Structure formats: C-alpha cells, structure tokens
C-alpha cells in the first residue's frame, strides 16, 4: 500500500513528480489507515483504489471534478469521485442527480451505468478533497491529512503550461478555490449534487457545457462527456 511503496510505483509518472512535495504526507496517510484497521475501524475505498485518480496521466488533465469524500456505502467507492462499478444498481443518489443534470445540460440519454472511467480516460480528474471515509460516516476522515495531498495535486495542475477548468462540488471542494488563481485555470463553483444541497443550485448549473465553452475559449479540446 502507500505505507509500503513510493509514489513512482503507486501513481502515474507525471503525478509521481507533481505529488513529490507530499510523498511523506502520502506515507503518513498509509499509517493513519493501518492504525484505523488496527483499532477495528474500516475505510473506503479499498487501499489499492485510494489513489486511483492519480493513475490517469497528469499532463492529459483538462477538467478537474472535486467532490468532498468517497461514497460511504460499502461496494460504491472505487477511487474515482462519484464513479461506481459498471454492475452497481441502484445508483447512489448523488450520481442519480449528476446524470439528471448531465441529460438536462448535454441532451444525452441516461447513461447505461454509473461507470465514469471514460471521463478519466478523456482528461477529467475525478478527485475528492479527502480520499478515504469510514463506512456509513460521511466526512469521517475530514482533517486527517488528505487535504494537504489534494491541495498539492491542485497547485501542481494549476502550475502546468496547460489549460484547466475546475468543477468544485460542495463546500470542502471549494476550499481549493484560492490555489486556483493561475491565469490558465478557471473555477466553476456549485452546491454538491447530494440531495441535501442539490436544489440549492446544482440542478441547472450546466457544469459540462460550461466546462467545454471555457476549454474552447482557452484553445483547448472540449471533453467528450457522452457515456455509453
């Protein structure tokens, strides 16, 4: 796990270099998670999926989606924010809300399933501000040291000689707003797609079409958002 091995082995080459300043903090998080198991508390997602968002190429990222923390229901979280395994049904409520906005915004049919890896394969970073959670306890790992790691990840993206659009979903995601001051970066901010906050302005936010207009405006290729 991230206790055992260096970034060079755990994440993609560009990410390994981008996250060098938090190499120790990443090892520290591995120890936090080992202490959780030792005490008999569980975490999500599975250890090998915690850093999965950093296994897609750093240099290929054009859009950053940031949520709060992983799905608290066992069998949901896969290390990509809001993504579920292609065989998961029903979809978690957040994802149902995201796909309703996806159809409203882009005019596409409902996706066949909740598997977002096409977005990750097409330059969308599916990040959470905090990369682990205790089952059934949303925000249970807030302030345990992931924030430094996702802050570093964002600074590094914003320092690239490349265009970037950030979609920040909810209050924890929005605390990355200051580290997105770079001129080649633009932030879309909305309430979380979670049922508690969705009606406060998630619905009708049109994040997907706006992201693409912003990319086009910076001479970047738009994202192909269409899922099968």
Ligand X SMILES: O=C(O)c1[nH]c(=O)[nH]c(=O)c1F
* Active-site amino acid positions: 69
**Closer residue to ligand X in complex, CB, 49/94:** 94
Would you state the structure tokens that stand for residue 145, as one six-digit string?
A: 């040291």
Instruction: Indicate the residue whose CB is closest to ligand X.
Output: 67
Rg (CA), the chain: 17
Task: Count other C-beta atoms under 10 Å from residue 170's C-beta.
Answer: 22
Q: Would you call 26 exposed, middle or buried from its count of C-beta atoms within 10 A (0-12, 13-18, 19+)?
A: buried
* Using rule CB under 6 A, residue 54 touches ligand X: no
Residue 167, Cα to own-chain centre: how many angstroms?
Answer: 10
What's the min distance (Å) between Cβ of 24 and ligand X?
Answer: 25
* Using rule CB under 6 A, residue 92 touches ligand X: yes
Task: Count other C-beta atoms under 10 Å from residue 38's C-beta.
Answer: 8
* Using rule CB under 6 A, residue 191 touches ligand X: no
**Closer residue to ligand X in complex, CB, 150/212:** 150
What's the min distance (Å) between Cβ of 80 and ligand X?
Answer: 8
* Alpha-carbon gap, residue 47 to 78, rounded angstroms: 10
* Using rule CB under 6 A, residue 43 touches ligand X: no
Phi, psi of 143 (to 5 degrees): 75, 20
Task: Count other C-beta atoms under 10 Å from residue 132's C-beta.
Answer: 23
Convert residues 61-80 into a mask of x (bound to ligand X by CB under 6 A) and - (unbound).
------xxxxxx----x---
* Using rule CB under 6 A, residue 94 touches ligand X: yes
**Closer residue to ligand X in complex, CB, 132/212:** 132
How many amino acids of this chain bind ligand X (CB under 6 A)?
16
Q: Would you call 9 exposed, middle or buried from its count of C-beta atoms within 10 A (0-12, 13-18, 19+)?
A: exposed
* Using rule CB under 6 A, residue 82 touches ligand X: yes
* Using rule CB under 6 A, residue 150 touches ligand X: no
* Using rule CB under 6 A, residue 194 touches ligand X: yes
* Using rule CB under 6 A, residue 175 touches ligand X: no
* Alpha-carbon gap, residue 1 to 31, rounded angstroms: 10
* Using rule CB under 6 A, residue 205 touches ligand X: no
Binding site for ligand X (CB under 6 A): 67-72, 77, 81-82, 92, 94, 128, 169-170, 192, 194
């Amino acid at each position: 796990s991230m206790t055992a091995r260096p970034l060079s082995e755990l994440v993609e080459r560009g990410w390994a270099a981008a996250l060098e300043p938090v190499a120790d903090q990443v090892a520290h998080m591995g120890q936090f998670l080992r202490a959780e198991i030792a005490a008999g508390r569980r975490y999500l997602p599975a250890g090998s999926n915690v850093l999965r968002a950093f296994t897609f190429p750093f240099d290929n990222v054009r859009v950053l989606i940031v949520g709060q923390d992983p799905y608290p229901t066992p069998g949901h979280a896969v290390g990509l924010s809001f993504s579920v395994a292609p065989d998961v049904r029903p979809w978690p409520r957040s994802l149902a809300n995201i796909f309703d906005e996806y159809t409203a915004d882009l005019g596409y049919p409902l996706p066949s399933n909740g598997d977002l890896t096409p977005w990750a394969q097409r330059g969308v970073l599916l990040l959470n501000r905090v990369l682990t959670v205790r089952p059934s306890n949303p925000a249970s790992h807030r302030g345990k040291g992931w924030e430094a790691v996702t802050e570093c990840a964002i600074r590094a993206l914003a320092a690239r000689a490349a265009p970037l659009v950030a979609i920040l979903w909810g209050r924890d995601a929005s605390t990355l707003k200051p580290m997105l001051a770079a001129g080649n970066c633009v932030a879309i901010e909305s309430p979380h797609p979670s049922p508690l906050s969705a009606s406060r302005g998630f619905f009708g936010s049109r994040p997907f079409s706006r992201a693409n207009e912003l990319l086009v405006g910076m001479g970047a290729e738009p994202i192909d958002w269409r899922l099968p």
